Amino acid sequence: LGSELVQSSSTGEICDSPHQILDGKNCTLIDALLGDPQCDGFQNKKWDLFVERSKAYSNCYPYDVPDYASLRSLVASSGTLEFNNESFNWTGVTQNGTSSACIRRSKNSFFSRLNWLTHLNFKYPALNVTMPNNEQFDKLYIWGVHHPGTDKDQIFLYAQASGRITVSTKRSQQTVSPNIGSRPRVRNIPSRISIYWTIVKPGDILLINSTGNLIAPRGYFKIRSGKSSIMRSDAPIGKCNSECITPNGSIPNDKPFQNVNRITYGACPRYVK
Ligand SMILES: *[C@@H]1O[C@H](CO)[C@@H](O)[C@H](O)[C@H]1NC(C)=O
Ligand SMILES: *[C@@H]1O[C@H](CO)[C@@H](O)[C@H](O)[C@H]1NC(C)=O
């Protein structure tokens, strides 16, 4: 309250020091995480602050994330996309499904970090696969359920009228079933995928049970930090050094308060309206 206690101005530009900034450009953090074909340049990157642009768009299989805001926050705070492949035992199914809705280098493809499993010899066995976490750090697994447009497609892919998936650890259990039906066509696709996530602590075991419709993980992400973050801004990133980042640009950390934006990253004045 009073102009000498409150910072109110900005240059419209975010400084690239002192924090490590990653410009999402045309990719959302979630598309970089799943491995959309336009986002392969983000693999394994780290950040203090991820800057997400309003013109970001998707170019792979159409999907939703029931828990979108939480998964986005978790990965943003973590500050890394470091990914480690694991070899799951997918005996009895066909692996590596691809789609014309997801083109990579001019061929049908799919999210790089997910594995679209389908029937083998007209049988989709009841999969029961495990992956112990014998590491000293937490693992994050991203997986999904495919919702076909029609019963014909469901049968063609899975040789099963309705899949059931349960993914569990000693600490949690999630069970999902496809919702078959035709939705508006995105890149000519009336079907969808819904994305889910599961953390496995050291000493715990990932258990995956599926009878159909599983979009499987190929491995795990690490959880690196709890102090990175994400912000939506269209400000350019320039070569300068400034302590407090806001969507409206970086500002110095000088007065007790600021009314530039309630969203900030770094050592900053407190927001006051
Ligand atoms: C993969 O899983 C099946 C269980 O249905 C088993 O028969 C097979 O031996 C497993 N492979 C390995 C290498 O454990
Ligand atoms: C599936 O793709 C993975 C990685 O792209 C590859 O290593 C593997 O050989 C493929 N498996 C099959 C059964 O096609």
One domain for residues 215 and 121: yes
Q: What is the CATH number of the domain that holds 216?
A: 3.90.209.20
* C-alpha of residue 138 to centroid of ligand 2, in Å: 26
Cα separation, 15 vs 33, whole angstroms? 25
Task: Report the domain count for the chain.
Answer: 2
Cα separation, 31 vs 189, whole angstroms? 18
Cα separation, 183 vs 169, whole angstroms? 33
One domain for residues 89 and 216: yes
Give how far Cα 165 sits from Cα of 14, 86, 116, 145, 234, Å. 44, 20, 14, 8, 40
One domain for residues 73 and 204: yes
One domain for residues 230 and 207: yes
One domain for residues 121 and 133: yes
One domain for residues 254 and 220: no
| Residue 117 identity | L
Total number of residues shown for the chain: 273
Cα separation, 54 vs 231, whole angstroms? 11
* C-alpha of residue 150 to centroid of ligand 2, in Å: 28
Ligand 2 neighbourhood includes 95 CB (under 6 angstroms):
yes
Nearest-CA residue for atom 3 of ligand 1: 91
The structure was resolved experimentally with X-ray
Q: What is the CATH number of the domain that holds 8?
A: 2.10.77.10
Which residues, judged by CB distance below 6 Å to any ligand atom, belong to the binding site of ligand 1?
89, 91
DSSP assignment of 226-238? SS-EEEE--PPEE
One domain for residues 218 and 172: yes
Ligand 2 neighbourhood includes 150 CB (under 6 angstroms):
no
Residues linked to residue 237 through DSSP beta bridges, in sequence order: 14
Cα separation, 185 vs 187, whole angstroms? 6
Cα separation, 82 vs 111, whole angstroms? 16
Q: Which domain holds residue 9?
A: 1-19+236-273
* Cis bond before residue 18 (omega within 30° of 0): yes
One domain for residues 10 and 138: no
One domain for residues 244 and 199: no
